[PDB]
Ligand binder design. Structure first.
Ligand SMILES: *[C@@H]1O[C@H](CO)[C@@H](O[C@@H]2O[C@H](CO)[C@@H](O[C@H]3O[C@H](CO)[C@@H](O)[C@H](O)[C@@H]3O)[C@H](O)[C@H]2NC(C)=O)[C@H](O)[C@H]1NC(C)=O
Ligand SMILES: *[C@@H]1O[C@H](CO)[C@@H](O[C@@H]2O[C@H](CO)[C@@H](O[C@H]3O[C@H](CO)[C@@H](O)[C@H](O)[C@@H]3O)[C@H](O)[C@H]2NC(C)=O)[C@H](O)[C@H]1NC(C)=O
Ligand SMILES: *[C@@H]1O[C@H](CO)[C@@H](O[C@@H]2O[C@H](CO)[C@@H](O)[C@H](O)[C@H]2NC(C)=O)[C@H](O)[C@H]1NC(C)=O
Ligand SMILES: *[C@@H]1O[C@H](CO)[C@@H](O)[C@H](O)[C@H]1NC(C)=O
Ligand SMILES: *[C@@H]1O[C@H](CO)[C@@H](O)[C@H](O)[C@H]1NC(C)=O
Ligand SMILES: *[C@@H]1O[C@H](CO)[C@@H](O)[C@H](O)[C@H]1NC(C)=O
Ligand SMILES: *[C@@H]1O[C@H](CO)[C@@H](O)[C@H](O)[C@H]1NC(C)=O
Ligand SMILES: *[C@@H]1O[C@H](CO)[C@@H](O)[C@H](O)[C@H]1NC(C)=O
Ligand SMILES: *[C@@H]1O[C@H](CO)[C@@H](O)[C@H](O)[C@H]1NC(C)=O
Ligand SMILES: *[C@@H]1O[C@H](CO)[C@@H](O)[C@H](O)[C@H]1NC(C)=O
Ligand SMILES: *[C@@H]1O[C@H](CO)[C@@H](O)[C@H](O)[C@H]1NC(C)=O
Length: 898
């Protein structure tokens, strides 16, 4: 029935093209104003997760816990121009070798670099900002020393303390070797056992553990460390931009300072937590010219290869109609308020250009092959061609729009934002193609009929060769061979289906030969500990009874399966349960603080005030009596009576490290009638983690210790849990269920494609099943290609897969319709008619995107662009072409109905 409205509409547009072009331009500039209005695009690193996800919400809770995770400005450092040197102690019999950067002079130089960074000045708001302004100092205003995890903090970042040398002027009883080999064994002691009782604490960033500062060593022999680590953590507020961009300005200042540091005895490696965003922005800028020149080639082909009489202005007009559809959909979607990811900016114009050029060429070459008959007015020729061809363009474009508009049902944000734009852009494309471009075609027909230079204003060469191609490869000679080869290759891709990869390799996602590739190679080469993991026991636990404490605490007196104990046992088998070390426990150190034996806690005679551990007043008595009931862990109120005193005491040589030092932010204290210990974390670290697989494993198993511990706890219903949080849990959680999301997405596509292209084709089941079955072949073979060229299954590749099928509809759909409706007496005859009539046009929506999908590789060296976008575009152009224009005519010659 569509042929009546299509025909009288073609005659209407041919009649009065002014109304058509004018109105359609009111539409075009109407929607395209939202492009200039909102224009908002999203680039925050939240692009790889949907809100209200598991890891996303857990990130919220940890963002009330200790707030945001700090930004890490790190330096992996080493000395190439020094050798080992051996320490022979006096006089006890043993020997300890010392690695290359363990030489004292190299340590001195590293301290010079460290002090050079310690006062680095950046200017924000025409003001002054140092590292002291942005670093996180735990203690304030007492001891605002910046947290710096370097080995030199064993000597308090001071040369005069590094050059202690107990011993007469011949023998050495204790030098830096000794203090080092004692601190890396008890790095929270304030008194060395021998050397003038030097402290192993630091300019307090904290008790410096040797995994955060030493690398390349072996097996608890820290004395052979081949590369030191200097970690400046800096506060990283998420809900504030003044302080954030302050820290970022200082970070690029740091990056430039390290890029320009002359020291022939050192080989550095560095990273500020703004390095990856800045280096990705830098990365996707070298190949923009190459994309533009690709589009230049494609537009040129569209201008010349249509049909000094040719269709140049026509091709330019169709190009502008496609771009008007793109900017129209972008305009309306920005109007309503929609972020516009870069993936969309890359995938959308290629798609809308392929579909638009396909419909354009179908219509134009549909008129060119057509011969009028006697009294044919332009209404009754171009309305006839429009009624003859428009059902195919409408079938394809409509199935595509309904399969892309339906792709945005999933939760993955990239494919969401993409598929919306895809749907509306293809629909507006078809509308500006059936309304405006028809009245644009009749006018070039008039121009060519009046004989005025078509640049200044039978069946050509290829219809011949298609007519020669069909019978040779459609005879019963070839007819089985095609099913043989395509079913065989299909089975091959089914074989390498389960053996395909997942994730983004860190070093390849960077412009090779940046300052970041060296960092990744040298953290795989040296470092011994990954990003910290915080084990959050949510608010609501007791913490104030022997039962409640035995559920949580570790070591002596507490249960076998408590939180700390389970984290520690999992730290034993660190190469499986990705968790590296024992957990920094707040309650375990609190119990070793209020000890009546260790004089760390003393309260006044009546005033009940905490007594500074260095005080001297005979009125502070025991916080807990040494009565056998007293010399015990504080159950009940006494707990809350002394916990805030612990979370205030700063390090004292007559006591420990104090609670303010490390656990002041690790323990939330809610003053609600009258004191409680809600929402506390236990911190440890995360082994290696040098590939996407490693990250996924760490996520799985850390959450496994989570649910596992929460099981061993007496949970009243499900109130609170014990979840783990690291920096990366939000980004590598898509891969936790990408396959279920792939299967679904593509699946829904092949459903929509199946529904429309079956009801649109006269409720004919077999035409659909054959067509979208061939498209399923396209996608499975596409996964085989993914295996062969080694591309991954992330959000980008999945988006390009959905779009890949949506573009395969443009190959198989037109042929399927052209065969389904025809009155030839044979299956083979209708196959030749369909393939010759439509295949000659479809192979002009192919050659342009191939000749662009060649220059795409030509000048673009970005590994992500060359491996993902180029090889996939190529894969779906060649794969789709060969599956719609080679196999499908054979499968239809076999099972195509009559
Ligand atoms: C990394 O450091 C390890 C520190 O323990 C070290 O083991 C130690 O190796 C030295 C080698 O000089 C042994 O010193 C030995 O020197 C005399 C020289 O004749 C030998 O006869 C003896 O074996 C003597 O022990 C240390 O004794 C040894 N330390 C211990 C506790 O056994 C590793 O060899 C170092 N490895 C690397 C790759 O650097
Ligand atoms: C998990 O893997 C770790 C490395 O991936 C591994 O450390 C490596 O293994 C041991 C240290 O335990 C050292 O191998 C050493 O074995 C004996 C002592 O048991 C000594 O003769 C030598 O020190 C020998 O080299 C490796 O040097 C060490 N590698 C590095 C880079 O430090 C862990 O031990 C593994 N943990 C478990 C629980 O298996
Ligand atoms: C925080 O660090 C500074 C230096 O970074 C410490 O200053 C040192 O003070 C003691 C004197 O009592 C000596 O080690 C040196 O005179 C200083 N060292 C340097 C490098 O200047 C300061 O004491 C630290 N603050 C606390 C509370 O420990
Ligand atoms: C920064 O401070 C250090 C001492 O902490 C000093 O040696 C250096 O000259 C200072 N640099 C600038 C630019 O102020
Ligand atoms: C900052 O302000 C001062 C005077 O207020 C001016 O002299 C200086 O040029 C400003 N800084 C920059 C970078 O323009
Ligand atoms: C601990 O170190 C200090 C140095 O400040 C020293 O005075 C004190 O005697 C040391 N303690 C012991 C028990 O040696
Ligand atoms: C390290 O380099 C400095 C200057 O670059 C030089 O004075 C010193 O001698 C060097 N030390 C070694 C061990 O090469
Ligand atoms: C803790 O001890 C019990 C015996 O009381 C034992 O059965 C259980 O396996 C232990 N837990 C772990 C994690 O080994
Ligand atoms: C502290 O108070 C008690 C009250 O029983 C008193 O006996 C004691 O003398 C007081 N402390 C001093 C140093 O006087
Ligand atoms: C006790 O400690 C605080 C800070 O730790 C310090 O300011 C105070 O002076 C100390 N007590 C005395 C009596 O000095
Ligand atoms: C959790 O794993 C531990 C092994 O460490 C075991 O004691 C406990 O039974 C597990 N929880 C459940 C619900 O199986």
């Amino acid at each position: 029935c569509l042929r009546r409205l299509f025909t009288r509409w073609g005659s209407f547009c041919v009649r009065n093209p002014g109304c058509v072009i004018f109105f359609s331009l009111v539409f075009i500039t109407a929607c395209s104003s939202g492009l200039v209005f909102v224009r908002v695009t999203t680039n925050p690193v939240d692009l790889w997760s949907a809100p209200s996800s598991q890891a996303r919400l857990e990130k919220e809770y940890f963002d009330q816990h200790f707030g945001p995770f700090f930004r890490t400005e790190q330096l992996i450092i080493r000395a190439p121009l020094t050798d080992k040197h051996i320490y022979q102690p006096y006089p006890s019999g043993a020997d300890v070798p010392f690695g290359p950067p363990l030489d004292i002079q190299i340590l001195h130089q590293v301290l010079d670099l460290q002090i050079a960074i310690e006062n680095i000045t950046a200017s924000y708001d025409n003001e002054t900002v140092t590292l002291q302004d942005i670093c996180l100092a735990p203690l304030s205003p007492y001891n605002t020393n910046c947290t710096i995890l370097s080995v030199l903090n064993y000597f308090q970042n001071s040369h005069s303390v590094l050059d202690h040398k107990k011993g007469d002027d011949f023998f050495v009883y204790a030098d830096y070797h000794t203090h080092f080999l004692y601190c890396v064994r008890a790095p929270a002691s304030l008194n060395d056992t021998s050397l003038l009782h030097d402290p192993c604490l630091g300019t307090f960033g904290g008790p410096v553990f040797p995994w955060l500062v030493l690398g390349g060593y072996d097996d608890q022999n820290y004395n052979n460390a081949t590369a030191l680590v200097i970690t400046f953590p800096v506060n990283n507020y998420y809900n504030d931009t003044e302080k954030l961009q302050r820290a970022q300005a200082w970070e690029k200042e740091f990056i430039n300072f390290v890029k320009n540091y002359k020291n022939p005895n050192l080989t550095i490696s560095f990273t500020a937590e703004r390095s990856i965003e800045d280096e990705l922005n830098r990365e996707s800028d070298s190949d923009v010219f190459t994309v533009v020149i690709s589009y230049a080639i494609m537009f040129l082909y569209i201008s010349l290869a249509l049909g000094v009489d040719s269709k140049v202005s026509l091709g330019i007009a169709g190009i502008l109609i496609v771009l008007s559809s793109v900017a129209c959909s972008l305009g309306v979607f920005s109007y309503i308020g929609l972020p516009l990811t870069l993936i969309v900016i890359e995938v959308i114009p290629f798609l809308v250009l392929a579909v638009g050029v396909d419909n354009i060429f179908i219509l134009v070459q549909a008129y060119q092959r057509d011969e009028r008959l006697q009294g044919e007015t332009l209404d009754q020729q171009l309305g006839r061609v429009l009624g003859e061809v428009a059902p195919s363009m409408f079938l394809s474009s409509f199935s595509e729009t309904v399969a892309f508009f339906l792709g945005a049902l999933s939760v993955m944000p990239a494919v969401h934002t993409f598929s919306l734009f895809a749907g509306l852009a293809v629909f507006i494309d078809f509308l500006l193609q059936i309304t405006c471009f028809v009245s644009l075609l009749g006018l070039d027909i008039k121009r060519q009929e009046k004989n005025r230079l078509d640049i200044f204003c039978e069946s050509c060469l290829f219809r011949f060769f298609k007519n020669s191609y069909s019978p040779l490869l459609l005879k019963d000679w070839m007819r089985p061979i095609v099913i043989a080869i395509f079913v065989g290759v299909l089975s091959f891709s089914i074989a390498v289906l389960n053996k395909v990869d997942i994730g983004l390799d860190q070093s390849l996602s960077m412009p090779d030969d940046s300052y970041m590739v060296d960092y990744f190679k040298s953290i795989s080469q040296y470092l011994h500990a990954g990003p910290p993991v915080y084990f959050v026991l949510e608010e609501g636990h007791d913490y104030t009874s022997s039962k409640g404490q035995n559920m949580v605490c570790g070591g002596m007196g507490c249960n076998n399966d408590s939180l700390v104990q389970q984290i520690f046992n999992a730290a034993q088998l660190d190469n499986y349960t990705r968790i590296g070390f024992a957990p920094s426990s707040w309650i375990d150190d609190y119990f070793d603080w209020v000890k009546p034996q260790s004089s760390c806690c003393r309260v006044d005679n009546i005033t009940d005030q905490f007594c500074n551990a260095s005080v001297v007043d005979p009125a502070c008595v025991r916080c807990r009596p040494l009565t056998p009931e007293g010399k015990q862990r504080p159950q009940g109120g006494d707990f809350m009576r002394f916990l805030p005193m612990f979370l205030s005491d700063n390090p004292n040589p007559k006591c420990g490290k104090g609670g303010h030092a490390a656990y002041s932010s690790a323990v939330n204290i809610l003053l609600g009638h009258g004191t409680r210990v809600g929402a506390t974390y236990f911190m440890t670290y995360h082994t290696v983690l040098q590939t996407s697989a490693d990250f996924i494993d760490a996520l799985k198993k850390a959450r496994l210790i989570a649910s596992n511990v929460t099981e061993t706890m007496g949970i009243n219903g499900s109130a609170y849990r014990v979840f783990p949080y690291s920096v990366f849990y939000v980004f590598y959680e898509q891969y936790l269920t990408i396959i279920d999301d792939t299967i679904f997405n593509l699946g829904v596509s092949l459903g929509a494609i199946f529904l429309v292209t079956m009801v649109l084709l006269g409720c004919e089941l077999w035409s659909a099943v054959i067509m979208c079955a061939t498209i399923a072949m396209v996608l499975v073979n596409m996964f085989g290609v993914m295996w062969l060229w080694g591309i991954s299954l992330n959000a980008v590749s999945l988006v390009n897969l959905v779009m890949s099928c949506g573009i395969s509809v443009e190959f198989c759909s037109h042929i399927t319709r052209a065969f389904t409706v025809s009155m030839k007496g044979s299956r083979v005859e209708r196959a030749e008619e369909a393939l010759a009539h439509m295949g000659s046009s479809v192979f002009s929506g192919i050659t342009l995107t191939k000749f662009g999908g060649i220059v795409v590789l030509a000048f673009a060296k970005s590994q992500i662009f060359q491996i993902f976008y180029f090889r996939m575009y190529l894969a779906m152009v060649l794969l789709g072409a060969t599956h719609g224009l080679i196999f499908l005519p054979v499968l239809l010659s076999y099972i195509g109905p009559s």
